Amino acid sequence: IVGGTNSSWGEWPWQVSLQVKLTAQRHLCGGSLIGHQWVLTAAHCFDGLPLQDVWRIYSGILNLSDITKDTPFSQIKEIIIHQNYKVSEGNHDIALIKLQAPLNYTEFQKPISLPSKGDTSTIYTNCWVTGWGFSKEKGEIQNILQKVNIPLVTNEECQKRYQDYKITQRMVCAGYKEGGKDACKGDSGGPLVCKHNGMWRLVGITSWGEGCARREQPGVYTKVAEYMDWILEKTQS
């Protein structure tokens, strides 16, 4: 996250860290708890490591540096990537993760509310993006979960800044014209949440963007409302 600030406990209890353990362990992507055994993230997080064995999912954690060999984590039972996902264009950048064991819900580990299929037209005015990614281009993973408040931008405005790629109605953009606040490397898969009526709703999944926090270069997110049929089909008992 560029231009953000440090989060406190319980602000973002759905936020998870997807880590890979090969010879060393490292955070690779964010994700959102949506059910006792379900995490929604970006398909691109599994480009390269599509097998479940190397993954460890940490929930109920604020500060990655607080993680030790005794910290509990979840394992992956199944990775469900959208069938139409295309790496080069970032279309259908969405994946579900089934956890091997259901998590108990706590004030620091609980699901985010998902939008309604009709929310495709909803205007959200108070949106935030969170994660442990770089605080600047060519930066480093951040220890404390960062948060930043960013306005949503129209598809029309977003398309102008990305003439080399199509911005679809299944994508939502967010960013400042003067830049300075944005997601970045390592925030991939994490949530874009909007607050209305005291309730938080998952609106976007961090997907792609040119650089980080550059002027007139909004970030691109998977628009969750546009995948609600897919999500409910794939998570059906």
Partner: peptide, 10 residues
């Protein structure tokens, strides 16, 4: 890697 990838190793 995609041109505007956020993937850490990209």
């Amino acid at each position: 890697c995609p041109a505007y990838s956020x993937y850490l190793d990209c």
